[PDB]
Design a protein around this nucleic acid. Structure first.
Ligand SMILES: [Mg+2]
Ligand SMILES: [Mg+2]
Ligand SMILES: [Mg+2]
Ligand SMILES: [Mg+2]
Ligand SMILES: [Mg+2]
Ligand SMILES: [Mg+2]
Ligand SMILES: [Mg+2]
Ligand SMILES: [Mg+2]
Ligand SMILES: [Mg+2]
Ligand SMILES: [Mg+2]
Ligand SMILES: [Mg+2]
Ligand SMILES: [Mg+2]
Ligand SMILES: [Mg+2]
Ligand SMILES: [Mg+2]
Ligand SMILES: [Mg+2]
Ligand SMILES: [Mg+2]
Ligand SMILES: [Mg+2]
Ligand SMILES: [Mg+2]
Ligand SMILES: [Mg+2]
Ligand SMILES: [Mg+2]
Ligand SMILES: [Zn+2]
Lengths: 129, 224, 88
RNA sequence: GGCGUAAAGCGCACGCAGGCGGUUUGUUAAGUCAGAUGUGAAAUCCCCGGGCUCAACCUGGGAACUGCAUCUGAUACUGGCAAGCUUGAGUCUCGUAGAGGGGGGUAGAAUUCCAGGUGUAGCGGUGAAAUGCGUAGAGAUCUGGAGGAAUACCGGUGGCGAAGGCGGCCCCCUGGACGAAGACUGACGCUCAGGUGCGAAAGCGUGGGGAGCAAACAGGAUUAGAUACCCUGGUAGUCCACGCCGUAAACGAUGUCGACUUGGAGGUUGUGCCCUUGAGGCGUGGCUUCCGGAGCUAACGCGUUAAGUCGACCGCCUGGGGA
C-alpha cells in the first residue's frame, strides 16, 4: 500500500523530471508542502501550489537548465522502515555542500545548512543535488 | 518563407499517426484522416532561424553540404545546391565521407584524374572496353562524389532532406561538431539536429520550397 | 448469493435505515446470513473446495469487521454478536 | 551485495503475533532535538613539550574517552490520546462474459465384445519379418444389442481460476472477476515467521468398474550382445466412491501490495455518445498477445502485465563435489 507518501513525492518529482515533464501533481499534505517550500527556496523547482480544500492536490512546477533537469539526484533517507535522526554536530552535507539535505526539526522543515546554523538536529528526510 | 506560402506546397502534410516518433509531439498541430498534421506556427520561425544561421555561416566563406538522396528529389537537390556555389550528396551516402574523409578523399582524386584524363588527356584510344569500363568507374564516382568533388575540406554545415533517411550523414556530423539543419518529418528523430525544421520531407513541391529557399539565402549571405 | 429481498431486509434490521447499506453492523449481518446459508451448501458438497475459499473469505472478512467494531464501540459490538448469536 | 537464464521467490492461497500505514485539528512529550550539570579511575592511543649521547624507554600538560544518567526546554517528524475527514478498503443496486467449483441427467461418433445375413481365403504387422488371428468361416460388408472411456467440428499467442489445473449438451447448488450510476460505512488498510487449508501425475487402503491404452511379465524380431528401441499379447494402473500421500522443469525458472515514468499494431470482454440509416464514426474501463523508447542488464534480453523509477512486509542465497 501507500505507506510512504514522501518517497512517493520524491519519486514523482524524479520520474517526471527524468520524463522532461513541465509539472507534477500529487495528493497534498503539510509535510509535502513544507518540503516543496525548501525545494523552491533552494531553487530546485520553479514554484508550487495546492488546489482544493477537502481533497487538496499539490502541484510542483519543475525546472530545467541546459535542456537538463535541475534535480540531478533526489533520494529518500529516513523512511517508515528505518527512521534516521541526526544531531546538530552530526548533520550530513550532500556533495560537500553543493547539494542539500532536508531536515525536520522542532522548528519545522529546513536544509542541513539552516538547521546547522540554528543549532538543531532532526529527522533526515532526503538528499537533493 | 510564409505560413501562407508553405501551406500551399503541402509542407504541413506529414506521415500517418501509426509511424510517428513521439519526440515530435510539440510540432504537430494535430491529425486528420489518420495522418499527422504539423504546426506551421512552429515551422516558419524555426525555419527562418535556420536560414539566418546559414546566412551567417555563408558570409564567413562557410561551406554548405546539401544532403538528400531520395530518388524523387535527387536532381532538385543538385540544382538547388549548384545555384549557390556549394556542394551536395544526391545519391547513396557512402558511410564515412566525413569521419573517414582522408580515405574517401582518395576517391575524389580518382574522380578528377578520370574526367581530366578522359578530356584533356582525352585518350579515346582505348582497347574498346576501357571506353565503357573507365566510363563505368567515372559514371559511378560522379553520382557518388560529383557534388563534393571540389569541397576540399570538411563542410561547416549540413542541410539535410529527411533526418531518418539520412541518419548516417547526420551522425557523422554530430561526431565532428558540424551543425545540422534538417527537414525533420513527423516520423523522424529530431535529437541529432541542431536546428530542426519540421515539415514534409518527401513531396517534390515541398522539398523544392525549403531547398529553393535555402539556396537563395546562401547567395544573399554570399553577395554581402 | 443472498437474494435482493433478503439483502434489503437485513439492511433494514441492522441499519439506520434502508440506505445505511455499508454500516459495520449491516455488513456483518449480511456476511452472517450468507455463511449460514452456505453451511447447507457444503454439507452436501464437501468436495466444492473452490467455493469454500470464497466462504472462508466471507469468514475472515467478517472477523476483521467485528474486530474493528469492537475496537471502536464495544457496546455496539456486544449487541451485534449476541443478536447474531455468535462467539459461543 | 544479491535471487528470469550464474548460488538464491516457499507449488498456491487465508491468516494470528509482528513490522509498516492515507489526511485534518487539538493534546501529550516516550522516540527525536537543544542546553545545563554530574560521571565516564589511572595507564594506553593522539598533540606540544621535558629527560637518558640518539632511539627504543621514561616523563609534564593537553586533547580524547564519540558513552551513560538527571534536570530544563523545543514539538517538525514517529509513538500515545481524543474528535474527525473521504481519496485507500469495504457494503448496496442493476447488468455482462467465462472449460471457475460440486451434484444429477442426457447425447452422438468410434473402438472392443456378443448375436445374426452376405461372402471366401486370407487378415494383421514390419524397414523386412515372425509371433498372433482365420475354413469351429476370419478380415471385408450390412443389421441388431451390451459395455466402458473420452468428448471431433466450434477452437483461437481464445476464456476462467490463488496455484494445481478446468472443454459435448441440459438443469440444480455455489465462488470469483468486471462495468455503469449514485448512496452508505469511515483508514475498517498492506504484508505475514509460526498455524491452517488447497495442491498434476505416479503411488497406497477398502469396495466397485474395466472398452481403449499400458509399467510389470510372456512370446516374436533386431543386434557382437539387446534385460531396450519395433511387433503380437498383456497385469497393476489409467475410470467411480470414500480415505491416504503432499511431491514435479508445481515455470514467467520472475513473492505480495501500492505510486510513478514516451509509443505502434492486434486479440478478448464491459460501457457513454453519433443522420443506429452500412458489417461503422468519437470516447472510456477490465484482461491479453506481438514489437519497441528511455532506463536497466554480464550479456541474452526486460521494457506501463518492468527485469525501469520508488516505498511496505515476507521467503531465500553466500565456491564445486559431499547433500
Ligand atoms: Mg553478489
Ligand atoms: Mg525464456
Ligand atoms: Mg538457479
Ligand atoms: Mg512463484
Ligand atoms: Mg501546547
Ligand atoms: Mg631528547
Ligand atoms: Mg604521557
Ligand atoms: Mg595529564
Ligand atoms: Mg582515562
Ligand atoms: Mg500525532
Ligand atoms: Mg457402438
Ligand atoms: Mg455468479
Ligand atoms: Mg460521516
Ligand atoms: Mg486404487
Ligand atoms: Mg507393447
Ligand atoms: Mg496394488
Ligand atoms: Mg521442491
Ligand atoms: Mg520487447
Ligand atoms: Mg535499448
Ligand atoms: Mg561447499
Ligand atoms: Zn518522410
Amino acid at each position: 500500500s501507500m505507506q510512504d507518501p514522501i518517497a512517493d513525492m520524491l519519486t514523482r518529482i524524479r520520474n517526471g523530471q527524468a520524463a522532461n515533464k513541465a509539472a507534477v501533481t500529487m495528493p497534498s499534505s503539510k509535510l509535502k508542502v513544507a518540503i516543496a517550500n525548501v525545494l523552491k527556496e533552494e531553487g530546485f523547482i520553479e514554484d508550487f501550489k495546492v488546489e482544493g480544500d477537502t481533497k487538496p492536490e499539490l502541484e510542483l512546477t519543475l525546472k530545467y537548465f541546459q535542456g537538463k533537469a535541475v534535480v540531478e539526484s533526489i533520494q529518500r533517507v529516513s523512511r517508515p522502515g528505518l527512521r534516521i535522526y541526526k544531531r546538530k554536530d552530526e548533520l550530513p552535507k550532500v556533495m560537500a555542500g553543493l547539494g542539500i539535505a532536508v531536515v525536520s526539526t522542532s522548528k519545522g522543515v529546513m536544509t542541513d545548512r539552516a538547521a546547522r546554523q540554528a543549532g538543531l538536529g532532526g529527522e533526515i528526510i532526503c538528499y537533493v543535488a | 518563407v510564409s505560413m501562407r506560402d508553405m501551406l500551399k506546397a503541402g509542407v504541413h502534410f506529414g506521415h500517418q499517426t501509426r509511424y510517428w516518433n513521439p519526440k515530435m509531439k510539440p510540432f504537430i498541430f494535430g491529425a486528420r484522416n489518420k495522418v499527422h498534421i504539423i504546426n506551421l506556427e512552429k515551422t516558419v520561425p524555426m525555419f527562418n532561424e535556420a536560414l539566418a544561421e546559414l546566412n551567417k555561416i555563408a558570409s564567413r566563406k562557410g561551406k554548405i553540404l546539401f544532403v538528400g538522396t531520395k530518388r524523387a528529389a535527387s536532381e532538385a537537390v543538385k540544382d538547388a545546391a549548384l545555384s549557390c556555389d556549394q556542394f551536395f550528396v544526391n545519391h547513396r551516402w557512402l558511410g564515412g565521407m566525413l569521419t573517414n574523409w582522408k580515405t574517401v578523399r582518395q576517391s575524389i582524386k580518382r574522380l578528377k584524374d578520370l574526367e581530366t584524363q578522359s578530356q584533356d588527356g582525352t585518350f579515346d584510344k582505348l582497347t574498346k572496353k576501357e571506353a565503357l569500363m573507365r566510363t563505368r568507374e567515372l559514371e559511378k564516382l560522379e553520382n557518388s562524389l560529383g557534388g563534393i568533388k571540389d569541397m576540399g575540406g570538411l563542410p561547416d554545415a549540413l542541410f539535410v532532406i529527411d533526418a531518418d533517411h539520412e541518419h548516417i550523414a547526420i551522425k557523422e556530423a554530430n561526431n565532428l561538431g558540424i551543425p545540422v539543419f534538417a527537414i525533420v518529418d513527423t516520423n523522424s528523430d529530431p535529437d541529432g539536429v541542431d536546428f530542426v525544421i519540421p515539415g514534409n520531407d518527401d513531396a517534390i513541391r515541398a522539398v523544392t520550397l525549403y531547398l529553393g529557399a535555402v539556396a537563395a539565402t546562401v547567395r544573399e549571405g554570399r553577395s554581402q | 448469493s443472498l437474494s435482493t429481498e433478503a439483502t434489503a431486509k437485513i439492511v433494514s434490521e441492522f441499519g439506520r435505515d434502508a440506505n445505511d447499506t455499508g454500516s459495520t453492523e449491516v455488513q456483518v449481518a449480511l456476511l452472517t446470513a450468507q455463511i449460514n446459508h452456505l453451511q447447507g451448501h457444503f454439507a452436501e458438497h464437501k468436495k466444492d473446495h473452490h467455493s469454500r475459499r470464497g466462504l472462508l473469505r466471507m469468514v475472515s472478512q467478517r472477523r476483521k469487521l467485528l474486530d474493528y467494531l469492537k475496537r471502536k464501540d464495544v457496546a455496539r459490538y456486544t449487541q451485534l454478536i449476541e443478536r447474531l448469536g455468535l462467539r459461543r
